[PDB]
Amino acid sequence: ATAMLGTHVIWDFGLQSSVTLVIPWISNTHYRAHARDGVFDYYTTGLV
Amino acid sequence: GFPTELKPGTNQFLTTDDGVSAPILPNFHPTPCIHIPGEVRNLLELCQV
Amino acid sequence: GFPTELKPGTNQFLTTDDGVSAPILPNFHPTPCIHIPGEVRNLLELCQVETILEVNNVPTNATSLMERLRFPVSAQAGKGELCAVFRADPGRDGPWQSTMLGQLCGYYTQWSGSLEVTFMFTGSFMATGKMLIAYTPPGGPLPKDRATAMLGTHVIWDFGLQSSVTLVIPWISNTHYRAHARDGVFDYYTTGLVSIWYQTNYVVPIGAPNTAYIIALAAAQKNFTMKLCKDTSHILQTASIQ
Amino acid sequence: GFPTELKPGTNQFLTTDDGVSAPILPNFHPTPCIHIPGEVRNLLELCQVETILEVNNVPTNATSLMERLRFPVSAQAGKGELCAVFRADPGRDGPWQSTMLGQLCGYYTQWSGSLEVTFMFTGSFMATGKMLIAYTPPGGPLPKDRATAMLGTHVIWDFGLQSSVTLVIPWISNTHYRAHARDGVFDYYTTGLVSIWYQTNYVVPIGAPNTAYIIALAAAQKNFTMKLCKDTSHILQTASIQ
Amino acid sequence: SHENSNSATEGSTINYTTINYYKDSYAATAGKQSLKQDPDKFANPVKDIFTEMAAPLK
Amino acid sequence: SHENSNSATEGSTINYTTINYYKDSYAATAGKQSLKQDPDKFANPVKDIFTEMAAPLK
Amino acid sequence: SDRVAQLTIGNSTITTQEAANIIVGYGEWPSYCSDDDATAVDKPTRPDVSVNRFYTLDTKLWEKSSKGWYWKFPDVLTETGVFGQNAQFHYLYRSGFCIHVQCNASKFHQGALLVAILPEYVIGTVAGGTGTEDSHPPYKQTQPGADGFELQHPYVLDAGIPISQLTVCHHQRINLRTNNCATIIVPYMNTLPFDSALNHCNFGLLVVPISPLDFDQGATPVIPITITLAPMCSEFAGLRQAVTQ
Amino acid sequence: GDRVADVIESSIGDSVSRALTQALPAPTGQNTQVSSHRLDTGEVPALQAAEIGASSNTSDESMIETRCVLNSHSTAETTLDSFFSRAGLVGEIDLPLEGTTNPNGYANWDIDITGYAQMRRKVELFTYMRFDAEFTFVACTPTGQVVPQLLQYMFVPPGAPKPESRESLAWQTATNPSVFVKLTDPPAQVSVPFMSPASAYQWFYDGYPTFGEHKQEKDLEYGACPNNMMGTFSVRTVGSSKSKYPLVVRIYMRMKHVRAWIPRPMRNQNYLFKANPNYAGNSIKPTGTSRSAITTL
Amino acid sequence: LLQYMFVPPGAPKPESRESLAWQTATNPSVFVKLTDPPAQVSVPFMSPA
Amino acid sequence: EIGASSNTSDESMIETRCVLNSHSTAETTLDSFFSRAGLVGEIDLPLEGTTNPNGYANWDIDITGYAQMRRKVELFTYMRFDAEFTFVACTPTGQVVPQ
Numbered sequence A: 001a002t003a004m005l006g007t008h009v010i011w012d013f014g015l016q017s018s019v020t021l022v023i024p025w026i027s028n029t030h031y032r033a034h035a036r037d038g039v040f041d042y043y044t045t046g047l048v
Numbered sequence B: 001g002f003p004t005e006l007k008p009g010t011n012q013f014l015t016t017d018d019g020v021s022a023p024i025l026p027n028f029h030p031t032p033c034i035h036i037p038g039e040v041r042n043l044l045e046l047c048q049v
Numbered sequence C, D: 001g002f003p004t005e006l007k008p009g010t011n012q013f014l015t016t017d018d019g020v021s022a023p024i025l026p027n028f029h030p031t032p033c034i035h036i037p038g039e040v041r042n043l044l045e046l047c048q049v050e051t052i053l054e055v056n057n058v059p060t061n062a063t064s065l066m067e068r069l070r071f072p073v074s075a076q077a078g079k080g081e082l083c084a085v086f087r088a089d090p091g092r093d094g095p096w097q098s099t100m101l102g103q104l105c106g107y108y109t110q111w112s113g114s115l116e117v118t119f120m121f122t123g124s125f126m127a128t129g130k131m132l133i134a135y136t137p138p139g140g141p142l143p144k145d146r147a148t149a150m151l152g153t154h155v156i157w158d159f160g161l162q163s164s165v166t167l168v169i170p171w172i173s174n175t176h177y178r179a180h181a182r183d184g185v186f187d188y189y190t191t192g193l194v195s196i197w198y199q200t201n202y203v204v205p206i207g208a209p210n211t212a213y214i215i216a217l218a219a220a221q222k223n224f225t226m227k228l229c230k231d232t233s234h235i236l237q238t239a240s241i242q
Numbered sequence E, F: 001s002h003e004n005s006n007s008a009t010e011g012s013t014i015n016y017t018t019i020n021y022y023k024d025s026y027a028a029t030a031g032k033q034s035l036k037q038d039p040d041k042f043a044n045p046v047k048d049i050f051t052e053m054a055a056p057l058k
Numbered sequence G: 001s002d003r004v005a006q007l008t009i010g011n012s013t014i015t016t017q018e019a020a021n022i023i024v025g026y027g028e029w030p031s032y033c034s035d036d037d038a039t040a041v042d043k044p045t046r047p048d049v050s051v052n053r054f055y056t057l058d059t060k061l062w063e064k065s066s067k068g069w070y071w072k073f074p075d076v077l078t079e080t081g082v083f084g085q086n087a088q089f090h091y092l093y094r095s096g097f098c099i100h101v102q103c104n105a106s107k108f109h110q111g112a113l114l115v116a117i118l119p120e121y122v123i124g125t126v127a128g129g130t131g132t133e134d135s136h137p138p139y140k141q142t143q144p145g146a147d148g149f150e151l152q153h154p155y156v157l158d159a160g161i162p163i164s165q166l167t168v169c170h171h172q173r174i175n176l177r178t179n180n181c182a183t184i185i186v187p188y189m190n191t192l193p194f195d196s197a198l199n200h201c202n203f204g205l206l207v208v209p210i211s212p213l214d215f216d217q218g219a220t221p222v223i224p225i226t227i228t229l230a231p232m233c234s235e236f237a238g239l240r241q242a243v244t245q
Numbered sequence H: 001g002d003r004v005a006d007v008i009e010s011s012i013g014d015s016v017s018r019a020l021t022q023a024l025p026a027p028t029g030q031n032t033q034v035s036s037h038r039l040d041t042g043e044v045p046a047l048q049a050a051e052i053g054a055s056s057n058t059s060d061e062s063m064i065e066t067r068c069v070l071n072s073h074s075t076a077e078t079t080l081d082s083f084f085s086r087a088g089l090v091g092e093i094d095l096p097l098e099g100t101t102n103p104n105g106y107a108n109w110d111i112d113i114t115g116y117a118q119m120r121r122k123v124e125l126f127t128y129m130r131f132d133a134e135f136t137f138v139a140c141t142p143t144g145q146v147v148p149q150l151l152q153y154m155f156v157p158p159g160a161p162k163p164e165s166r167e168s169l170a171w172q173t174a175t176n177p178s179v180f181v182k183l184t185d186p187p188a189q190v191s192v193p194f195m196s197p198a199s200a201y202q203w204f205y206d207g208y209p210t211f212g213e214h215k216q217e218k219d220l221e222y223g224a225c226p227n228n229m230m231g232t233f234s235v236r237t238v239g240s241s242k243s244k245y246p247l248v249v250r251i252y253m254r255m256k257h258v259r260a261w262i263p264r265p266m267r268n269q270n271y272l273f274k275a276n277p278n279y280a281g282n283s284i285k286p287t288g289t290s291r292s293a294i295t296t297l
Numbered sequence I: 001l002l003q004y005m006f007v008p009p010g011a012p013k014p015e016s017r018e019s020l021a022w023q024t025a026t027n028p029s030v031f032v033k034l035t036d037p038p039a040q041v042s043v044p045f046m047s048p049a
Numbered sequence J: 001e002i003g004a005s006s007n008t009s010d011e012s013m014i015e016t017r018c019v020l021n022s023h024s025t026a027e028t029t030l031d032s033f034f035s036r037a038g039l040v041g042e043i044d045l046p047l048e049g050t051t052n053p054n055g056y057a058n059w060d061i062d063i064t065g066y067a068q069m070r071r072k073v074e075l076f077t078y079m080r081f082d083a084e085f086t087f088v089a090c091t092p093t094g095q096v097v098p099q
């Protein structure tokens, strides 16, 4: 019920067996560096 | 309040009176007519037989 | 003092009279109208919509009134058996009384034009089969076998991707309009019968259910017309309302 | 003997009937009219005039009925206290019943358009202060504190040379017109609430009076309209007149 | 159309749409008045009018 | 022909043939409506309509 | 070229391979109010992508003996998202909708569902059964939320009206041998150009199995039904504090 | 005022109602054209899909071999002004001498046309209706006998003071419209306008009219549309003393200039209360008639 | 006072004085007093043929 | 203090939209507000009594005898009007007689 609030795609299995979730560019910065545990979690892209 | 005054000949039903009367069914269109043979238009067509 | 004389037809209230009457509020301008969707301009817009026909009007108790909207088809021995039959009279008391055609033709006395029943198969995808849907015009009694019912108008229906077929019951009448049939002198106005016969069979593989159900959907065509408005007869009202 | 037939609607006296009647005096020419000032052509000319709103409708005895036209503002502890609140329903029973809008909208059933309340400060010149005048639209209960009332429409008023401010209660309705609210099913038509909150405080120097009074003045806008004339309800009459 | 002009509105620029079957114009229907207002006669009766966006007491 | 336009059909392209003897148009006769239908509003309310001779689910 | 559909409104997307088509209700596409139909002078806010997107409510289990379920609109979206917060804070509301009902099953499963939209779907009671007690339904049954409420008498739709004539409304079928989705688009239907969302439910969505679900033992018995709906051309006006009901 | 491209290329603020359909003139029924045999592939008009929800577009020129039939049958009797412009009993008021219901020579009747089943079932085919009306009052003794008696029919809009007695003050009808009639004269007859605050009446209101915590006590407000409470109708025997004839007033409402929106399923169960779609639960009648079997008739 | 109801075929015939069909919502009806002139209505051609 | 009313519109106080108002001012006119008949007087002609026991009755014309019609005309101080009187005679019991 909470995850439908983000970006999402509803996928129906059928003849076409594949779907694309285009994780879009939603950042405050123009570029983002590599996330890791600590101060650099500021650069995380999210979850899927 | 248009002024009128009722004359005699009023509230009487004369059977041979030909006047306009009130319809019961609005927007009724009756069944169309076909060609039936034998259309009697005048009863004097039948005295000549 | 304009001379007038009162004719008969006076001091009477005819309910179907369309005349000018006295207003109670002067210089009243009513609230302006917005665009609401669904403007019904003619009631014949509503007879062309496909509503469910209660062919299977056998169950009566309140727990089985939803069994009344769909009739079954099963695996038979391939003799050309009979599935179901129903009269094609909308204003009559029967399956059509569960339609918006059979409730609005109750408010009218004389109807004309063609009908159309639209059957829909709600079985498996792996199931196949064939049915004969025959319209037997008047005079024809209940057909005893399929060999006679193919003489009337009929359609052979093959289950597949398209799950639905239309039997256009056509306009075959001596009259231009026809009134509502009922038992007695007015059976002269009956529209006929519609039967459904197993042409081949209902074939099903292993692991799929051996019985299906069909949903009939009834409507009208663009040539349909009604006439001579009345009061509906096939609904009553026990007293002491409120 | 012109043929006519009498329809229903005959030998009845409808009070709101506008027809031609029989004169009693022939060839009477009435006295010519002079220019008198004040020609009222439309009653909506009179709803746009600012009349006093009896917000402080607490006192009841005859000796204190002039205390009913002005409500006070004093020195508080600066917590954002509540001064006064009053419903914005003119046809309802309350402060607006002391207006020429709330007495003429009693002779009508359905009203539309915006209002405007016009508060005026009758304190000293050396006194300063600020007030928040919030219109809380419907659904909103009585606000418990100022933090919620700033969410509605509001005006922040600074006492000074110009002693008066207008809160234009705007037209926020689902309907085009709205009838008169009252307790029950008709609370669906309520216009809202109007509250007055101390923004900062009422500051006063030495030697000036520590309490002031505010006079509210209520009117209507150019978009105001009324409809469906009736009989006024919020005034009665004990019998034995003369 | 000969008829006496003897109603209590003869002598005004107001337009009326009346029906009468008599010679006496005071018998006529009420009709449709002209929809003209003068709100600034009661609501802004000042000698030197002032603008909305301005301060009234300058 | 001065008369108030205050019926519940003023504001529509529908044509009416009415009789009125008053200034109030809500008093008039019902008249003859315009015989216009819109059957595909209830019977074929689909975005992309499909032909009769075609298969509907292609 | 018709069984496939992609519905992209906002930041959400639905992809389907066994579609029927898209029904536009009463031949009308949702729109915003005009300067003539509107009466409120306050400017309305038009949050164009934050509320105009798909929301997934719950999942209902279709069983052999399932009688039906109904959901009132927009009661379903009063505690869900930015729609259910602009509505708590505003007094007015005006939106269309795009409903989407999912029920996927195999090619060895059979059944049907009638997915109809009934405007102003008032709810009745059995009146004590005998018809002598003047009763009214409770609040959990008239505005039941996103969980829905189960129809106790589906033949009369718990309102005295029949299920057979419901095809005069908007509707689609979900026939498990042809399709598994039903896309209905609904404009704003009311006498008023704007209306309150917390008191007035404009329409009701009815999901009724005409043909019962049947399958053979060994297959998948748990067959859910899932409602997924999007506001469209939403508008809000009249801003005050937050109220739940 | 617009610089970014995500507001120039926006479909925000489109006020026009994009309609797929167009109302075409249909004065007669549709004419049939001539049709011969077809023995082709791909063209298959008998096969539909009702899962689409749309109805069949199948004509009889596609299913059978037909002839030309110039149909000159009119669609003028299925209009709404031909279906609703038919007066029906919406109310009935009784003015007895001795009794308990109305023993003081006056009677108030809250205007609802949802009190007689035969007129309720027609308007409840639609959910929104906008109409001017034409009421007609038919006063008489219970025995059908007509008497020489004068009456006052006052219309009391909402908010106006309701009359509490025969000799009350509201009967002076300075602003409320009133009608005086003798029972020997024809029935009265007045035309009412569309008097709603809204754009149309609505016989079904799915919702509560007030705000507030909805509890068991204040439950009867469910379904009350106050846009529809058009007021109150009142009757008295004009006099200072009691009358000497018992009366019964019958009210007959005819619509004109009708418009309607959003059709509905029509009812099949028996009504029980006013402004209430309740029904009996143990006695749920089916819509039609039963059979012994499906293969027999 | 009297009521003259026209009941077309199929419409429910009234079984009593206080029945339900006399509400004349679609059936045409005529109310008349015996002291007034005779009633008078014009009927159309109403046949299916 | 100037005595004039506010010229403040809602286009100046809040952020507003275009609202083409087509609401009429035709029902607030005086011919729509006063052209509504009301009881200005009431005369009684008893058989036995003291007020009018001789079969005749005089009534000095004043429309300031019933509160519901007085309060409307006393909203203005000068009025110029043609009138339309209507007499509704009956027995006290409401019964109509041949007289």
Ligand SMILES: CCCCCCCCCCCCC/C=C\[C@H](O)[C@H](N)CO
Pocket (backbone or CB within 6 Å): C024, H111, H112, H113, H114, H133, H135, H153, H154, H155, H177, H178, H179, H190, H192, H195, H201, H202, H203, H204, H228, H229, H230, H233, H275
């Ligand atoms: C001199 C007496 C005149 C009487 C006029 C009465 C006013 C009638 C107004 C229109 C009535 C329309 C019917 C309205 C709806 C009903 O109340 C229904 N219960 C609505 O659900």
Ligand SMILES: CCCCCCCCCCCCC/C=C\[C@H](O)[C@H](N)CO
Pocket (backbone or CB within 6 Å): D024, J061, J062, J063, J064, J083, J085
């Ligand atoms: C055949 C009978 C005809 C009766 C006609 C009566 C004449 C009426 C003249 C106009 C009356 C206007 C009302 C005048 C004012 C009242 O007297 C008030 N008390 C004035 O303060």
